Amino acid sequence: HMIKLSNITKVFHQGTRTIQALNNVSLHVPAGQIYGVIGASGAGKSTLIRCVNLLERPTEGSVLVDGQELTTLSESELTKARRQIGMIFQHFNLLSSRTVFGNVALPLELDNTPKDEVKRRVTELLSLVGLGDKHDSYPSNLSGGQKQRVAIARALASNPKVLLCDQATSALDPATTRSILELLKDINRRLGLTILLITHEMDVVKRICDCVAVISNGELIEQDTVSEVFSHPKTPLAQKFIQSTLHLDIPEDYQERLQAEPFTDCVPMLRLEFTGQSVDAPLLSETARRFNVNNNIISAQMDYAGGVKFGIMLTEMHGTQQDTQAAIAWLQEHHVKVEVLGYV
């Protein structure tokens, strides 16, 4: 009951036409947990995350952060509200004129904070983010990673209860994203900071998120624990993103040769999803012996998401139509979700 966005809808009257950004979006982020909202470019990730802070006004709905209604509020009270919700962004939005020290200090000077308390507060957050070294530097000097730590430190300046991330590592590279995401996680785990997160990369969700919602055109299609979404994904669109966190490519020549209608001399290529219980079990070797079947494994990968192992396989199965149907049955029996992609 940390943050509760209920029925959030935002619409635009930008030109001669009215475009709909979000539809009855409802999400609840438990206190001390990390919630990621994932979606394609244009789904309303940006608008949604902005409704929490009320940089954007939801046409209709309810924004309840830390228990307090935010939608209807006095402008002098929204400022009192933002001292609990810091924000970080894709592009870093750091002031080019001020040192990393002053940059972290900036939200504090917005309240009439004493100069003596400020310096103590700033150094700790600079020591926390790993920039305690670079006290006297300007954003033009810092690398992408450095700059993002500053922005996080700055958001953590007001010692906020909730942290929002607007594609925060969408600009940083793979090597750096992980350390920022790990730093961002540690702050949550070590300090209990509630984090809301939007991204378009599923790699991001699985690395640090505890719950996850998949959004497509303003509507939420799958909404559940990270573990349940990475194992037993109920949406085809949801599968697309998961199958991307692991790099599972079907070689160009297969999808061309592969056809959904069964033909003479054909064998089924099927993709298998393993949930935690079956991921480490050598079931494809067992399946080879028991039912006298030959599996041509095209590609396969396993990973962890939400503290739960999972994995996916792409394979064509050779054998008798009776044998094939039998081993598939043994896989479904052993918590491996079998799904036939067609025949080749």
Partner 1 sequence: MSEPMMWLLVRGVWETLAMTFVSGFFGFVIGLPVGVLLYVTRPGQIIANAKLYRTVSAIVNIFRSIPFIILLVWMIPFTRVIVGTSIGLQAAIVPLTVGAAPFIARMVENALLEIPTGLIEASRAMGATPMQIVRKVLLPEALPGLVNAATITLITLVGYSAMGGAVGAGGLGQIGYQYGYIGYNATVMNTVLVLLVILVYLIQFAGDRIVRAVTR
Ligand X SMILES: Nc1ncnc2c1ncn2[C@@H]1O[C@H](COP(=O)(O)OP(=O)(O)O)[C@@H](O)[C@H]1O
CB of 177 to ligand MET, least distance (A): 23
Ligand-binding annotation for 280, yes or no, is yes
Residue 259 or 296: the one with the smaller Cβ distance to ligand MET is 296
> How many chain residues bind partner 1 (CB under 8 A)?
30
Residue 296 makes contact with a second copy by CB under 8 A: yes
Residue partners of 88: CB distance under 8 A and separation at least 6: 148, 151, 152, 155, 163, 164, 165, 166, 168
| Site for ligand X, rule CB under 6 A | 12, 14, 19, 21, 39, 41-47
Distance CA(207)–CA(181), nearest Å, equals: 7
The DSSP bridge partners found for residue 116 are none
DSSP element (H, E) containing 205:
helix 202-208
Q: Which of 41, 19, 9, 1 is nearest to 219 (CA)?
A: 9
Ligand-binding annotation for 279, yes or no, is yes
CB of 311 to a second copy, least distance (A): 8
Residue 96 makes contact with partner 1 by CB under 8 A: yes
Residue 13 or 190: the one with the smaller Cβ distance to ligand X is 13
Phi-psi group of 199: left, alpha or beta (phi > 0 → left; psi -120 to 50 → alpha; rest → beta): beta
Interaction partner, residue 302 (ligand X, a second copy, partner 1, none; CB < 5-8 Å by kind): a second copy
Residue 177 amino acid letter? T
Residue 256 amino acid letter? E
Ligand-binding annotation for 296, yes or no, is yes
Distance CA(130)–CA(186), nearest Å, equals: 13
Residue 56 or 124: the one with the smaller Cβ distance to ligand X is 56
Binding-site residues sit at 41-47, 279-284, 296-297
Binding residues for a second copy (CB under 8 A): 246-247, 249, 251-253, 280-282, 284-289, 292-304, 313, 316, 318
